[PDB]
Amino acid sequence: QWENSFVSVYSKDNPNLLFNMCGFECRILPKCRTSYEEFTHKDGVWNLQNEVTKERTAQCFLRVDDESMQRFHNRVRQILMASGSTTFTKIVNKWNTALIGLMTYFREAVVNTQELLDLLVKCENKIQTRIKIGLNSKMPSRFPPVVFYTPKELGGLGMLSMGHVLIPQSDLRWSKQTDVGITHFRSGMSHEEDQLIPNLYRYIQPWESEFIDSQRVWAEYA
Amino acid sequence: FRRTIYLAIQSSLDFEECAHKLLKMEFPESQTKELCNMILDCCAQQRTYEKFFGLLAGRFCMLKKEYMESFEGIFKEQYDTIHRLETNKLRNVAKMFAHLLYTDSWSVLECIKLSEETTTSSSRIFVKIFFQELCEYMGLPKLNARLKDETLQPFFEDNPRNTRFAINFFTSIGLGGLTDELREHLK
């Protein structure tokens, strides 16, 4: 059915080649077309290297597909809804499992999707807000992050948290078109003090690097 | 300071954010050596090569003229530990300098030398990788250019023996397509 299908076309009129495989939304822009300024970027940018000439002939941008984000969101909503009884330590397990489920899989593509970052932030805030509801308070001074983010070895909940990161925001009018870059940041979540929290994404190795590493490791192994 | 850097870097997605987080804090500048020493150590010490920690070191250079200097220094500081570091982390480095040098944060190389005289089998591997990465980007032709205008000597000479060590060694690396002129010179 044409309705479910999708088509993209590369021709002298169309530089960009879009497609969707598995969960990944992929764009491909050659350097033989108008790439203008050649530049690097976060690992969300893959370099497509000619096997013959060992040259970087194009760039593939990754983006986390819509339906995927939808599935994750329904998974969080599953955690909130399906548990009214269950213990608070148990929910945090549910969160952690789902969250690494997203992050180990997507990795690089996550950082180039702003919609995800938003969704994660609001969802962390929803499960923590729910645990708050669990006792009776919403009062922030009664739930500093030390209680949620302590590894339960010391008696916290051991919550894996990706959502204290800053969320890049620039120029909606232009950002809907030309990919302007980052002129601003929005605060994802609160911190009692200046403080900090570590992000999962920083501790996971990107897919590109683990691929190259794989090839090298095997060859050296032989 | 050393601990704050780590926390700011482990926190941030992207490489852009860590610099913003770091600059924002407005930590004292002179330390702008050791900080960067921090980044080079912090990821390289970190288990496997990751694109992020290498980019960060570089941007931190373009923003202030000194940061660039701070890096080139830190590359020098390697000579002492060229032998000493264990044979994984060379796998992070070789590339990791590969990505500062492909993108122009080359002639700083020259300081590095090929001799059985003094090169650490460590250092041997270090440089080995460094080329097997940087090549894979420039693709061995643009590299032909960059070298041909480089005037890198301690690498590329006298010492017909050391021309056997050089050229041979780049048959071992395998690239050995930038070793031609030297082959002629042997003759």
Binding site: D118, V121, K122, N125, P168, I182, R186 | -
Partner: peptide, 26 residues
């Protein structure tokens, strides 16, 4: 000046809506 940036209102957002400018831009 909300220059088309930030949320319409930090109501459902999970945040405090705080937008400071990118301190490292260029």
């Amino acid at each position: 000046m909300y220059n088309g940036i930030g949320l319409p209102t930090p109501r459902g957002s999970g945040t405090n809506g705080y937008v400071q400018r990118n301190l490292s831009l260029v």
